[PDB]
C-alpha cells in the first residue's frame, strides 16, 4: 500500500497515538514510495492499527527528481506541504507523539520542514529517520534546531548523495533492510522512552 492519508482521513474524536509523516524519493510512487510502507507496517505491529496513523506527504509534493538541486534539496511547494501536514496533526490531534522520516529528496524535504516548523510543534516529534540524506555533508548530519539524539540517519558507503554529490549510485537504492528493522526499531524506541509503555 504505497498510498496512506490516515491524518487527513481520521476522526478527530478518536485520535491515534502516534502519528507517522512520511516523504518519500524522487519518482517514487503514491505518497510512501519504496520504503514507507515496511517502515508502516512495523509501526502498525507495535502500537496496533488504531494507535498509529500513517500519513505520506502528497499533494503539491510530486518528487521531481530536478528539484533536488534546489537551494533547500527541494522545492518551496513541497516544504508547505509537509509543514501543513506537521499544522495539522498539532490541530487534529494535540496529545499524539509525532514521529517523521524521509528518504532522498525526501530526506532534504523532512529536514527544511522540521527546521522551518514552530518550535512546540518541531518539540513534540520524538523521532526522525532519513535514509539517503542528500543534505547529510552540508548539514554534518544533522536537522537544523532538532537535537541529534532524536536523528538517526541511514546512508550507505558509496551512496554519494551522503558525501555532496547529487548522483545516483547503487547503494542509494539499497535501504530496504534499514527500512524494515533499524528505522522502525528507532522509531518505536523513541515513542515508547517518551510515552512509556
Given at each position: 500500500?504505497?498510498?496512506?492519508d ?5 476522526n478527530?474524536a478518536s485520535?491515534?497515538?502516534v502519528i ?17 510502507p515496511?517502515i508502516?507496517?512495523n ?7 488504531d494507535?498509529?496513523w500513517?500519513?505520506g506527504?502528497?499533494?503539491a509534493?510530486?518528487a521531481?527528481?530536478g528539484?533536488w ?14 509543514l501543513g ?12 507523539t ?8 525526501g530526506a ?5 520542514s522540521?527546521?522551518?516548523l ?7 516529534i ?11 555533508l552540508?548539514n554534518r548530519?544533522?536537522?537544523p534546531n ?10 550507505n ?18 535501504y530496504g ?5 533499524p ?9 515508547r522512552?517518551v510515552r512509556?509503555?
Amino acid at each position: 500500500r504505497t498510498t496512506r492519508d490516515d491524518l487527513i482521513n481520521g476522526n478527530s474524536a478518536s485520535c491515534r497515538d502516534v502519528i507517522f509523516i512520511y516523504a518519500r524519493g524522487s519518482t517514487e510512487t503514491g505518497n510512501l514510495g519504496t520504503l514507507g510502507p515496511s517502515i508502516a507496517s512495523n509501526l502498525e505491529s507495535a502500537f496496533g492499527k488504531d494507535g498509529v496513523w500513517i500519513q505520506g506527504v502528497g499533494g503539491a509534493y510530486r518528487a521531481t527528481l530536478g528539484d533536488w538541486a534546489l537551494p533547500r534539496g527541494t522545492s518551496s511547494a513541497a516544504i508547505r506541504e509537509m509543514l501543513g501536514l506537521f499544522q495539522q496533526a498539532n490541530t487534529k490531534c494535540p496529545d499524539a507523539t509525532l514521529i517523521a522520516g524521509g528518504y532522498s529528496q525526501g530526506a532534504a524535504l523532512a529536514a527544511a520542514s522540521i527546521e522551518d516548523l514552530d518550535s512546540a510543534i518541531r518539540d513534540k516529534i520524538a523521532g526522525t529517520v532519513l535514509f539517503g540524506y542528500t543534505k547529510n555533508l552540508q548539514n554534518r548530519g544533522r536537522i537544523p534546531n532538532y537535537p541529534a539524539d532524536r536523528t538517526k540517519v541511514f546512508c550507505n558507503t558509496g551512496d554519494l548523495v551522503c558525501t555532496g554529490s547529487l548522483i545516483v549510485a547503487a547503494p542509494h537504492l539499497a535501504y530496504g533492510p534499514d527500512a524494515r528493522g533499524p528505522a522502525p526499531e528507532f522509531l518505536i524506541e523513541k515513542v515508547r522512552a517518551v510515552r512509556g509503555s
